[PDB]
Design a protein around this nucleic acid. Structure first.
Lengths: 98, 91
DNA sequence: AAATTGGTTTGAATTTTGAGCCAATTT
DNA sequence: AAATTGGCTCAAAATTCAAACCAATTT
């Protein structure tokens, strides 16, 4: 009665395919393509912060949306994110969203 | 100025970069839309898992399996890396 | 008025990290 | 045969966490 929704199809992105049809593809693939383009435009330079880079790039919208969803309520936001309220406050401060 | 971007196409078949954070935002708007006041519980682990896997796989590809160099690239400890690889069953 | 949240501490629990050591592997 | 990496343990550092108050805000 309930069709299986795989974890990769929970957070998805609209795309256009070879028959110009709009389809949902996983966000993972977006991350993959971004990283592939990042590597491709590197041309042999040394990296030491890739994790923090991606993490910032993903934490910022997440906090933005969850704060919009809860209408500024840090406690609910922290409770639905599954993190400590102090951690959430820390992160909010880190990205100037206080 | 934006190091992490993805490719988009418009109705005029022009291709253009866009920050990855826009994708993440879209995905979340869609997520919040599909569920109707159902409760969210572990959204951080959700997204973090959706993002850590392709990162590890791509960095492991770029370094052809060299965990030490991968770890150096990412800026985390090699132990942390082994742990994350274990977590997502990539070892 | 009552309930909830924000802002802030404290100290324990968990995670991350660095260093070491040597077999195993790559160079 | 030299140099580097993988796997593991160990201790420190750093981060996350709950829990506790009470003023401030929302209901």
């Amino acid at each position: 009665m309930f069709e299986q929704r795989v974890n990769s199809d929970v957070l998805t992105v609209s795309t256009v395919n070879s028959q110009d049809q709009v389809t949902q593809k996983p966000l993972r693939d977006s991350v993959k393509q971004a990283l592939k383009n990042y590597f491709a435009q590197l041309n042999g330079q040394d990296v030491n912060d890739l994790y923090e880079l991606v993490l910032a790039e993903v934490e910022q919208p997440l906090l933005d949306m969850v704060m919009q969803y809860t209408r500024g309520n840090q406690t609910r936001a922290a409770l639905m994110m599954g993190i400590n309220r102090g951690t959430l406050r820390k992160k909010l401060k880190k990205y100037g969203m206080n």
